[PDB]
């Protein structure tokens, strides 16, 4: 069985076994939807260690890896002899013929955004930084502005999806697309994704858990990074998705979409505060940076000598010549240094 | 006809005095009027205007009535006071226009940079310039009944530093203000048309009533003062133009001190 929106159907339902990427298993295990199956050493030996590392979370093994998937540039040899090496040359080649991929899912367009340095949940000192969300940096901004510029240049449709892209590529209409190993059974040549601003594309590597093509896939993978396993990924993805729906459709600018994504990523903010920040970013983008700074500030808020006298009538204590003279004056006004009478 | 001339001139002096005194009283009596920094400039202007009606106009009026200059050993100081007051009023108008432009173009920076200290410094600079151009040359015999003939170079320099440059500054200031207002009105009209000229005409009429009055009042006087030394024109027309430039002092508060706030102040004061 393969119900639609499986990643979104499973949470509300919890099938005996689920076959999906490991990035979603984090949120599932955070609430206790997946059963902790006990693995065997003989079963761990027959599998690669990097797969176990990718599927590892909180120091425990959740499910068994099946295979490694990564995006690659699939082009038709009948249309062009060699594939473009840099994104900047696609706008030209395209206009010389007249690239098309899934514009709805953010996983297909994230490589272009992260090519120039876009990142999320930075991996520092061997751990992910949930507070350091760099989806609003210069790299992601350049990637998304280039994406919307290509969309506006009559190069890619704003409503295209995986089905339309596949149907157009099978008929020989489009010259190239971006797809992973799952599209080979339905479909030529495949290669690494083109570079952007000199920097290489960073596609996420989705390891499923419970030859020249493989070479290109592994090269795209090692050029990218493995998807995190923190529960904050799923929601984050949705945020990015909205940005995509806010970028290709032209509903708002790039800065507004990135600010919306940043606000949606913050889980600690309630619904009312989230809507307030969204409206603040809508009605005033001039200070959007300060608004995001205040939103972050609020995110960490809702996160779950002495003298002794022994006279005949006056006795007790009170508080070297510089002090002895003052003590003598005080004693005179009263009618360790000790004085008695 | 001399009697009628006297009547008219006296009426003008009395109206100028009454306007200046009313403006000064309405400004110094209420606190919310002095809260605005720009109003300070107006005060200076008013003060200058007041002097024009006290130490300048009455003496010339009585001299023209009598037909000569009875005030012996007073012509030099009188001409000095006249030049000082004229330069002070012109520079006050110029700085008022500059302040209005700075407030309209960039109000966020105007509210933070323009402070009472800055207004006082500008007023003091204008007064010192007026003094340096009026008293220093006259007392040192550089400008040379009484008629006070004028040299060519000194007259040209005074007309250039006290009328031409401030006039050009005010012209460019009002031009920038008009361009900004026209851009805003065009934006509003485009928005209204997308949602589905009287404002520009009103702005033009306001700018005209503001500038053209002083222009027609003070242009021919300086033109004659610059043409006569080079040579001719008669003294009657020169005196008429001087009286027009002086009546401009009385007309000033009607243009610069007749807004809604000043109207309410005059209504609640009397």
């Amino acid at each position: 069985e393969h119900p639609d929106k499986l990643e979104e159907k499973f949470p509300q339902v919890a099938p005996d076994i689920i076959f999906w990427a490991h990035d979603r298993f984090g949120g599932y295990a955070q609430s206790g939807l997946l059963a902790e199956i006990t693995p065997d050493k003989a079963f761990q030996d027959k599998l690669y260690p990097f797969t176990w590392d990718a599927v590892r979370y909180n120091g425990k093994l959740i499910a068994y890896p099946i295979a490694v998937e990564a995006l690659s540039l699939i082009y038709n040899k009948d249309l062009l002899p060699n594939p473009p090496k840099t994104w900047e040359e696609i706008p030209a080649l395209d206009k010389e013929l007249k690239l098309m991929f899934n514009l709805q899912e953010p996983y297909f367009t994230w490589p272009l955004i992260a090519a120039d340095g876009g990142y999320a949940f930075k991996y520092e000192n061997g751990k992910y930084d949930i507070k350091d969300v760099g989806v609003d940096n210069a790299g992601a901004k350049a990637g998304l502005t280039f994406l919307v510029d290509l969309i506006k240049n009559k190069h890619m449709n704003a409503d295209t999806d995986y089905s339309i892209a596949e149907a157009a590529f099978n008929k020989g209409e489009t010259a190239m697309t971006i797809n992973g190993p799952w599209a080979w059974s339905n479909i030529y040549g495949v290669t690494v994704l083109p570079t952007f601003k000199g920097q290489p594309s960073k596609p996420f590597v989705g390891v499923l858990s419970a030859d020249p093509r493989i070479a290109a896939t592994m090269e795209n993978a090692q050029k990218g990074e493995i998807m995190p396993n923190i529960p904050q990924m799923s929601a984050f993805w949705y945020a990015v998705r909205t940005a995509v729906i806010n970028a290709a459709s032209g509903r708002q600018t790039v800065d507004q979409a990135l600010a919306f994504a940043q606000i949606l990523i913050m889980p600690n903010l309630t619904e009312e505060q989230r809507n307030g920040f969204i409206q603040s970013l809508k009605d005033d983008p001039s200070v959007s940076k300060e608004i995001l700074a205040e939103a972050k500030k609020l995110n960490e808020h809702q996160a779950p000598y002495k003298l002794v006298i022994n006279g005949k009538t006056l006795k007790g204590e009170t508080t070297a010549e510089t002090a002895e003279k003052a003590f003598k004056q005080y004693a005179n006004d009263n009618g360790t240094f000790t004085v008695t009478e | 006809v001399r009697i009628l001339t006297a009547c008219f001139l006296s009426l003008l002096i009395l109206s100028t005095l009454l306007g200046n005194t009313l403006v000064c009283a309405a400004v110094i009596r209420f606190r919310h009027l002095r809260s605005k920094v720009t109003n300070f400039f107006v005060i200076s202007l008013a003060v200058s205007d007041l002097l024009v009606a006290v130490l300048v106009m009455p003496w010339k009026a009585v001299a023209e009535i009598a037909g000569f200059w009875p005030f012996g050993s007073f012509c030099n100081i009188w001409v000095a006071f006249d030049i000082m007051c004229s330069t002070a009023s012109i520079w006050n108008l110029c700085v008022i226009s500059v302040d209005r432009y700075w407030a309209i173009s960039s109000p966020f920076r105007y509210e933070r940079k323009m402070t009472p200290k800055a207004a006082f410094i500008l007023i003091s600079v204008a007064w010192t310039l007026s003094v340096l151009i009026s008293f220093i040359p006259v007392q040192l015999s550089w400008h040379k009944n009484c008629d006070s003939s004028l040299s060519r170079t000194y007259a040209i320099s005074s007309s250039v530093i006290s009328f031409y440059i401030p006039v050009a500054i005010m012209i460019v200031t009002y031009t920038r203000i008009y361009r900004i207002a026209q851009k805003q009105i065009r934006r509003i009209a485009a928005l209204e048309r997308a949602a589905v000229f009287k404002r520009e005409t009103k702005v033009l009429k306001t700018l005209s009533v503001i500038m053209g009055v002083f222009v027609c009042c003070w242009l021919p006087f300086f033109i004659l003062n610059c043409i006569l030394p080079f040579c001719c024109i008669d003294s009657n027309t020169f005196d008429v133009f001087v009286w027009f430039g002086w009546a401009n002092s009385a007309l000033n508060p009607i243009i610069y001190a007749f807004n809604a706030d000043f109207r309410k102040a005059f209504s609640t004061l009397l």
């Epitope: - | 209005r100 109000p107 203000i177 306001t206 503001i210 807004n259 809604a260 706030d261």
Partner: nanobody, 120 residues
């Protein structure tokens, strides 16, 4: 005459959001500034936010990023969003409309403001 009808103020828990709205009825010149000020009992009236007809906005150093002012396209309706409210934000919020109809001066219109209380 110009009338300013303000609304949206009231009681709100700390950290919540609130949207105040001021409707300006009457003939207003193009060049005009619309701002929100706050006055607390005992203290003096201080500036909170302001916006010019050209789209530029200005905020105080204590409400920068937290508060956001905006104006409508043609309705001349001023909106003020406040997020992450603090206990020291309770005050009477007034709407100041500075009109430059007379180029030689400016006219200030107020709408008596409305009360805003932040709980703790």
């Amino acid at each position: 005459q110009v009338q300013l009808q303000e609304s949206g103020g009231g009681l709100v828990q700390a950290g919540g959001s609130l949207r105040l709205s001021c409707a300006a009825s009457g003939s207003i010149f193009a060049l005009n500034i619309m701002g929100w000020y706050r006055q607390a009992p005992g203290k003096q009236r201080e500036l909170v936010a302001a916006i010019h007809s050209g789209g530029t906005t200005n905020y105080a150093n204590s409400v920068k990023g937290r508060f956001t002012i905006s104006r409508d396209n043609a309705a001349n309706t001023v909106y003020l969003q406040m997020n992450s409210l603090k206990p020291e934000d309770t005050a009477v919020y007034y709407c100041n409309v500075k009109d430059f109809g007379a180029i030689v001066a400016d006219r200030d219109y107020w709408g008596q403001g409305t009360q805003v209380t932040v709980s703790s």
